Design an enzyme around this catalytic site. Structure first.
Site, PDB file in Angstrom:
ATOM      1  CB  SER B 198      83.991 -11.436 -40.009  1.00 44.05           C
ATOM      2  OG  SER B 198      83.565 -12.144 -38.813  1.00 44.05           O
ATOM      3  CE  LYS B 220      85.966  -1.882 -32.135  1.00 43.10           C
ATOM      4  NZ  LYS B 220      86.487  -1.503 -33.701  1.00 43.10           N
ATOM      5  CG  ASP B 221      84.397  -8.635 -28.486  1.00 41.57           C
ATOM      6  OD1 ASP B 221      84.152  -7.541 -30.043  1.00 41.57           O
ATOM      7  OD2 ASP B 221      84.221  -9.437 -29.190  1.00 41.57           O
ATOM      8  CD  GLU B 264      59.143  -8.095 -22.520  1.00 42.40           C
ATOM      9  OE1 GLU B 264      58.469  -9.338 -21.971  1.00 42.40           O
ATOM     10  OE2 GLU B 264      60.046  -8.064 -21.518  1.00 42.40           O
TER      11      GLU B 264
END
Ligand SMILES: CCCCCCCCCCCCCCCCCC(=O)OC[C@H](COP(=O)([O-])OCC(O)COP(=O)([O-])OC[C@@H](COC(=O)CCCCCCCCCCCCCCCCC)OC(=O)CCCCCCCCCCCCCCCCC)OC(=O)CCCCCCCCCCCCCCCCC
Ligand SMILES: CCCCCCCCCCCCCCCCCC(=O)OC[C@H](COP(=O)([O-])OCC(O)COP(=O)([O-])OC[C@@H](COC(=O)CCCCCCCCCCCCCCCCC)OC(=O)CCCCCCCCCCCCCCCCC)OC(=O)CCCCCCCCCCCCCCCCC
Ligand SMILES: CCCCCCCCCCCCCCCCCC(=O)OC[C@H](COP(=O)(O)OCCN)OC(=O)CCCCCCCCCCCCCCCCC
Ligand SMILES: CCCCCCCCCCCCCCCCCC(=O)OC[C@H](COP(=O)(O)OCCN)OC(=O)CCCCCCCCCCCCCCCCC
Ligand code: HEC
Ligand code: HEM
Ligand code: HEM
Ligand code: HEM
Ligand code: HEM
Ligand SMILES: COc1c(O)c(C)c(C/C=C(\C)CC/C=C(\C)CC/C=C(/C)CC/C=C(\C)CC/C=C(\C)CCC=C(C)C)c(O)c1OC
Ligand SMILES: COc1c(O)c(C)c(C/C=C(\C)CC/C=C(\C)CC/C=C(/C)CC/C=C(\C)CC/C=C(\C)CCC=C(C)C)c(O)c1OC
Lengths: 48, 373, 54, 240, 49, 76, 55, 373, 54, 76
Positions: B198, B220-221, B264
């Site tokens: 990442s 954390k997730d 939408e």
């Protein structure tokens, strides 16, 4: 203090699970009861 | 163990940057939302019937007679809305922090975005309300814009002269089958990311400071999943219809058009662009480019710094881009009349000029200020 | 769970063409592999012309 | 388009954790049964739903056995009729859409099952429309079978004032003023469009409580497992 | 199995026994709770209801 | 994977056990100052686009209304 | 340790309570809906059947 | 592209044994059949309605009004039959050549076999004929056998007192969703195998003689695909009803029971076993074991030679096992009456005794003959 | 309701409006749909011929 | 992967190009003998189980028929 707790039901993982499961088994009873009291009272006179 | 090896390399020990903020949670949230949608969708599929005589009746039967069927239906609808919220914030993170230089990951991403938009469109057609039917005709009509083969393509999709049962049933089949293709494309997405790892908000090489994922970015997730579930359940259990269209609670009357037809909340930005271009075809193309301009984004990076943490002029241009994206979302809602139209036309011109022209020129200027250019 | 066929079988009651269970007129399993007698719903004989079966 | 936008009324079913007044739903069901059922349909609502809302099983059956319903095919194959059952849905006031159109001067009384959900700001709209049959102003003229209801789109609703003060008598005896009747039928129609309103809000309270417990904690576990790093004190000590 | 008919093997198990029981207990409690088994839960004074 | 990620030298790194350190050391003590520190380094880059979105939104609404409003002089 | 783990144990029960609840409604969804459950009181005419016949 | 590596690692530069016969084609055929089923299933899903009033009408509308809809429907049905033919020959190859010593691959296989049987059962329920409805009730009833929670489970699945619309719709959802899980499990099946490589008919270590797969076992798989397509299209275009039941062309009558109730032919072996055991529960268990005995198979290998190429006594026992599997397939068809029953009872006894007892004893004897034991 | 001359889009007319009328008109027996009779009857083409001529 | 599969020594391996060799060298010349060679090494292991399946199948059918055939002595 928690120490006594820890050394007894929170230090051995197996016991950790036991305390969790047992607590959860009763928590539902308490939570539902307490929660219902709150909700019903908020709307008392309107239920049924 | 050859099945567990994957997890160890991917989920348990993957070397992740230590300084990634809460924005890096959002993609994992998207995966969770995907499962949630699939699970809720499966429990809508055990009672939904894709027949134009019985689709609205089956939806009302789900809401009224199935035990907690209203819960699963409104969880599905507000989870689609939560999916698009997390998708927009994921794309905004990728644009802000220079993550588009992972070009294969970015292109698999924009393919996933197209697939998710198509899935949500056909899913919104599925309850066969007033708004679903007129919305379907509208976008299906969009295809007719094609210069030569347009008419045929539209009729093909419709499966007849005009959307009718023929459409509903094939839209049910396609709306069922596409989230599994989305899951496979997400595996390819995470795959092409595993090959690279990442990015971090500073945009620098984070190889000197990487930590495991199991105890640091898992809890954390989990916390981000809990917060997203809090927002989803306060959207479902308290303001269920706040993110819907009242006219979708009427049955589909091919004879009448609900006057306030509108896509939408998530399709609006595109809707605005389409309406802005006078030419029908132009609108369709611009609309497509609206999404595609992102794919084009990794070839427009002209700066020597990956992220926007140390780039204030491009930060200002980025927040102006977020600003007129919100403006285009508002305009789509507004009806066709002065001065909503002009704003729409400008907002679209400003959107394409900021992404295409202003950001690389600003990056060149920023490189000139640091005595790099 | 198949349908026993009335007026057929070796016990003048019922027979299930699925696996050969023969039920007597009482619906009691007499021959075959069917485990228990057919169930009798808690009906109601309001009249010799009206019976409210559950 | 150009339309009067119904104001916000202080309802009770609006409270974040507030359920529908069930006596008002019972009164509004009486209003629908005696007034609104002549022209509007409720295809997705059946007597069984009422049970546990404002009526008991026996009462509901009373209600059910107070109406007539067709009953599929006779053994002879001749469709016959039967006393309404708790499983029967609400009766059609017009066998087919055409019938309604014809009777109601071309207007199709919309099914009032989801009217509140289908109309923007429905609860308000409903109340406003039913209580908004004001006189057309100068400059506007409406044809027969039309009425100037500012709220109705086009201010020309085929339905005539359907609620004249004391139109029906509430069994509870609460004065049947036009308003008391419009508020009751708006509560009922609301209930109709969402029979689960009450059950849901309960879960909502419960969810908040749980999040209010789990969210804070999950944060403490995360800050435990992230404290280690957040206290890391780097230092570069080159050989020098 | 030849290798598993052993003296230390037995010792290990004996030492492992208590933990094993605990785990079954957790599951049993879990099953009772998850299934809302009332046959068992009816015994518990507070849990009743 | 780990071990072959990067090459650093002479960078010592001290740390403490989770249970040995306070969970929320000076959480509101410095958290507030920091959050405020943060907001003042980013507010001028973030806020004025959304401010002019608010002005354009209001303007559009009002302008639209005026557009809809009837001109009495029109009929004469 | 007992303070930190008690929080882990507390949280678990909470999650466990929510997880059983979520899974419970889902499981329950597949159970009979209200429409079917509301089936009873079939009426039968004795005159319909004569001796030695089933209906 | 990194993916190309994975693309090559499993299909181009994969070292395969040079001497594997045509039986090793069959698994690839299964994958092709899976895709074919999915593709045909998708084109059945654009017109099928999972409503008990309209399911038979939608199937007849597919056969009569959709352009080449009869072709796609009978391709789907005969492709399910071809799937089970290739599955049985794949399992027979695994049993004969000692490929069950790849234990993880074998266990993922028997999971795939259970999933495929469940998918085919619910798919056969889906057209809502006479035979589908009585077949569903029958097997759903099988579950009721469970000692304590049986009744509940049955009612759960049925979604009501008896199979009715509630079932049909959830069976449509489950029959839609399970082949994608089958595809994911097949990906896990391929992974757990490449770690070890394929086996050869001699059962020896083929590391000295391995060849590429692209030019040698690809054109071979293409030829096998062509032959399987020849058999599938001569099953569809010439004898479209030789494997199905005629009573499925009648609408589902709950009042009328058929005189003889069968599942489709590939369930017969199991059907026979179930009927054989007098006790209902016993039947259900034995039935399950019938499939599960395979999983149990890698723990019953008592020979020092992996394959049966050099093992004639166990070859004789294997062909006797194939023989009474064919006998059990025939018996299932036969009605309940002498002497079909006794054969069924013996055939089941012989099946379980050959797999459980006779083959390891024979392997011990064969090891004794080569002066190894 | 109203009756009109059949169109190329009209299906073949029903003999009875519902199967209970078929039961009443055919002495308790239900004449089945002959659309798929050949496919629904084992060895249909033959059966049909045989039955009609048997 | 290739290169690390196995260790062999002194095993020379000659081969020819596809286009240089006949596609079906003596296909029916030796193919038939071989196929026949093959069938005679496996026929005694394969065939007699299926032979007794055929006998049991026929037997069952005929026995079943006889079973169905009315007992003449009965009913008289
Ligand atoms: C303000 C008053 C309190 C204060 O000063 O707090 C300081 C504190 C910041 O202290 P700091 O030392 O400067 O920063 C270190 C962090 O505390 C280190 O913690 P962190 O902020 O990195 O935590 C990870 C992040 C994780 O956040 C996420 O995962 C968010 C996921 C995305 C949002 C949800 C998705 C849907 C979005 C729809 C729009 O969590 C948060 O940002 C806050 C979580 C709060 C949980 C509930 C607490 C009650 O402020 C906060 O944490 C803000 C939130 C709480 C107030
Ligand atoms: C016997 C009369 C012919 C003869 O004697 O030739 C010698 C020859 C035997 O020669 P060999 O020296 O003993 O063995 C080398 C093979 O010839 C080398 O060729 P092969 O037979 O091993 O070929 C690989 C095999 C590979 O087979 C497969 O791919 C099987 C795929 C699965 C089965 C098919 C899918 C559907 C399964 C439904 C159950 O393909 C075949 O089985 C023959 C394909 C013929 C295509 C049509 C030609 C006209 O006989 C045959 O080749 C029989 C097959 C062709 C006829
Ligand atoms: C909303 C405002 C969020 C915010 O806090 O903005 C300031 C923040 C500063 O980030 P930075 O300067 O990198 O420093 C972070 C570490 N101190 O800057 C950021 O938060 C950057 C966040 C990147 C993602 C923002 C997404 C906003 C919504 C975008 C929707 C449209 C995305 C594009 C669609 C096409
Ligand atoms: C069918 C007969 C096929 C046949 O030709 O049999 C002989 C063949 C000989 O094989 P082998 O002795 O290994 O030598 C081959 C290389 N010269 O032997 C073989 O071909 C062995 C084939 C192994 C796979 C046979 C599968 C048959 C179908 C089994 C279905 C049931 C499986 C179990 C289900 C539970
Ligand atoms: C009981 C007091 C009520 C309530 C709450 C409503 N009605 Fe009626 N209605 C009738 C007809 C012919 C129409 C259609 C007229 C037209 O479309 O021009 C309606 C319509 C409505 C609506 C829908 C308004 C909309 O915007 O679509 C609503 C919310 C409504 N009504 C409320 C006919 C009748 C009756 C026969 C004379 C009577 C009685 C009622 N309605 C009663 C009620
Ligand atoms: C394979 C999994 C899925 C299945 C089986 C499924 C099935 C269904 C079914 C049956 C409906 C109609 C019921 C209803 O009206 O809510 C529906 C509606 C819908 N689905 Fe899905 N779905 C799946 C995944 C998704 C995903 C991933 C999305 C998001 C992109 C999605 C978005 C929607 C939307 C927006 C609706 C309309 C909801 C509404 O009526 O407002 N679905 N789905
Ligand atoms: C279908 C919805 C999507 C899912 C499930 C998904 C999933 C993920 C996951 C799990 C990650 C790793 C964790 C993270 O960094 O957040 C990730 C990262 C990433 N995704 Fe996605 N993604 C989706 C949509 C997209 C889209 C539309 C894009 C393209 C705009 C995209 C581009 C990226 C990039 C560039 C990263 C790298 C993050 C970084 O290192 O900075 N994703 N995604
Ligand atoms: C995801 C892919 C699939 C989809 C969307 C799908 C969809 C359908 C649909 C809509 C039908 C009903 C139409 C009909 O009557 O033929 C059907 C029938 C059926 N499907 Fe599938 N299917 C899929 C995969 C499979 C697979 C892999 C199998 C094999 C295990 C299978 C076996 C069957 C069977 C046996 C029937 C009944 C055919 C008959 O009426 O005789 N399907 N499928
Ligand atoms: C869903 C259907 C299945 C698919 C798509 C599938 C796919 C494959 C593929 C592609 C191979 C490699 C090529 C080959 O050797 O034939 C293979 C091999 C294998 N499969 Fe499967 N398979 C399936 C079902 C099964 C089942 C049910 C079993 C277990 C009985 C099984 C056990 C094996 C074994 C043991 C091998 C190794 C072959 C050997 O080296 O001898 N497979 N499968
Ligand atoms: C450390 O780097 C990683 C990483 O290694 C992984 C695997 C994931 C993947 C995490 C998830 C749980 C997302 C799930 C992704 C999918 C494949 C969605 C597919 C959904 C299914 C139906 C299964 C990351 O998000 C991530 O960065 C944070
Ligand atoms: C050389 O070793 C291999 C091998 O490397 C591979 C990948 C396969 C896989 C081959 C196939 C084409 C089968 C396809 C398998 C699936 C994953 C089925 C999934 C289906 C989809 C819908 C996609 C083999 O069959 C094989 O042995 C012959």
């Amino acid at each position: 203090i928690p120490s006594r707790l820890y050394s007894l039901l929170f230090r051995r993982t197996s016991t950790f699970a036991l305390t969790i499961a047992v607590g959860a088994l009763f928590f539902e009873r308490a939570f539902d009861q307490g929660a219902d009291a709150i909700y019903e009272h908020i709307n008392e006179g309107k239920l049924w | 163990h050859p099945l567990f090896k994957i997890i160890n390399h991917s989920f348990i020990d993957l070397p992740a940057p230590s300084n990634i903020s809460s924005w890096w949670n959002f993609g994992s949230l998207l995966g969770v939302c995907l499962m949630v949608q699939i699970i809720t969708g499966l429990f809508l599929a055990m009672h939904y019937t894709s027949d134009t005589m019985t689709a609205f009746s089956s939806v009302t039967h789900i809401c009224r007679d199935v035990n907690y069927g209203w819960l699963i239906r409104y969880m599905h609808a507000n989870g689609a809305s939560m999916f698009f919220i997390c998708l927009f914030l994921h794309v905004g993170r990728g644009l802000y922090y220079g993550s588009y230089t992972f070009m294969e990951t970015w292109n698999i991403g924009v393919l996933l975005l197209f697939a998710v938009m198509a899935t949500a469109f056909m899913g919104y057609v599925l309850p066969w309300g007033q708004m679903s039917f007129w919305g379907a005709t509208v976008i299906t009509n969009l295809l007719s814009a094609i210069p030569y083969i347009g008419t045929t393509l539209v009729e093909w999709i419709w499966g007849g002269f005009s959307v009718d049962k023929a459409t509903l049933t094939r839209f049910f089949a396609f709306h069922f089958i596409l989230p599994f293709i989305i899951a496979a494309l997400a595996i390819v997405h995470l795959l092409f990311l595993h090959e690279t790892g990442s990015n971090n908000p500073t945009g620098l090489n984070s190889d000197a400071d990487k930590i495991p994922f199991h105890p640091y970015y898992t809890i954390k997730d989990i916390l981000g999943i809990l917060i997203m579930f809090l927002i989803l359940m306060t959207l479902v259990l308290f303001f269920p219809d706040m993110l819907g269209d009242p006219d979708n609670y009427m049955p589909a009357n091919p004879l009448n058009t609900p006057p306030h037809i509108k896509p939408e909340w998530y399709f609006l930005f595109a809707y605005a662009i389409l309406r802005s271009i006078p030419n029908k075809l132009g609108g369709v193309l611009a609309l497509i480019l609206s999404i595609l301009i992102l794919a084009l984004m990794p070839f427009l990076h002209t700066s020597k710094q990956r992220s926007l943490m140390f780039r204030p002029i491009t930060q200002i241009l980025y927040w102006i881009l977020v600003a007129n994206l919100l403006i285009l979302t508002w305009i789509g809602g507004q009806p066709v009349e002065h001065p909503f139209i002009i704003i729409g036309q400008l907002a679209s011109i400003s959107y394409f000029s900021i992404i295409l022209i202003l950001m690389p020129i600003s990056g060149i200027i920023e490189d000139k200020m640091l005595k790099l250019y | 769970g198949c349908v026993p066929i009335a007026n057929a079988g070796d016990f003048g009651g019922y027979y299930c063409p699925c696996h050969g269970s023969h039920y007597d007129a009482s619906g009691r399993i007499r021959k075959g592999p069917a485990p228990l007698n057919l169930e009798v719903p808690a009906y109601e004989f309001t009249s010799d012309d009206v019976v409210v079966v559950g | 388009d150009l339309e009067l936008h119904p104001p916000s009324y202080p309802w009770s079913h609006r409270g974040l954790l507030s359920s529908l007044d069930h006596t008002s739903i019972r009164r509004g069901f009486q209003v629908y049964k005696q007034v609104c059922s002549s022209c509007h349909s409720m295809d997705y609502v059946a007597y069984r739903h009422l049970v546990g809302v404002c009526y008991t099983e026996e009462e509901a059956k009373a209600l059910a056995e107070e109406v007539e319903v067709q009953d599929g095919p006779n053994d002879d194959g001749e469709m016959f009729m039967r006393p309404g059952k708790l499983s029967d849905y609400f009766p059609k006031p017009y066998p087919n859409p055409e019938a309604a159109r014809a009777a109601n001067n071309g207007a199709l009384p919309p099914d009032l099952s989801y009217i509140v959900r289908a109309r923007h700001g429905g609860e308000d709209y409903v109340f406003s429309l039913l209580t908004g049959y004001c006189e057309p102003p100068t400059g506007v003229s409406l044809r027969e079978g039309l009425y100037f209801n500012p709220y109705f789109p086009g201010q020309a609703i085929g339905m005539a004032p359907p609620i004249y003060t004391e139109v029906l008598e509430y069994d509870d005896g609460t004065p049947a003023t036009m308003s008391q009747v419009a508020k009751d039928v708006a509560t009922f129609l609301r209930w109709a469009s969402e029979p689960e309103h009450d059950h849901r809000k309960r879960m909502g309270l419960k969810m908040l409580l749980m999040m209010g417990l789990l969210l804070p904690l999950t944060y403490a576990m995360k800050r435990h497992k992230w404290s280690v790093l957040k206290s890391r004190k780097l230092a570069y000590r080159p050989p020098k | 199995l030849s290798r598993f008919l052993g003296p230390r093997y037995r010792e290990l198990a004996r030492n492992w026994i208590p933990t094993a029981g605990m785990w079954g207990t957790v599951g049993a409690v879990g099953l009772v709770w998850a299934t809302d088994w009332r046959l068992i839960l009816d015994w518990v004074p507070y849990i009743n209801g | 994977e780990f071990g072959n990620l990067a090459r650093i030298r002479h960078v010592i790194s001290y740390s403490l056990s989770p249970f040995e350190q306070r969970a929320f050391p000076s959480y509101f003590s410095k958290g507030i100052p920091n959050v405020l520190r943060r907001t003042r380094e980013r507010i001028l880059r973030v806020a004025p686009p959304f401010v002019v979105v608010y002005l354009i939104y209001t303007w559009g609404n009002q302008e639209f209304e005026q557009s809809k409003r009837k001109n009495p002089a029109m009929y004469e | 340790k007992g303070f930190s783990y008690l929080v882990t144990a507390t949280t678990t029960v909470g999650v466990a309570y929510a997880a059983k609840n979520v899974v419970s409604q889902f499981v329950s969804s597949m159970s009979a809906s209200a429409d079917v459950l509301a089936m009873s009181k079939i009426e039968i005419k004795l005159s319909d059947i004569p001796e030695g016949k089933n209906m």
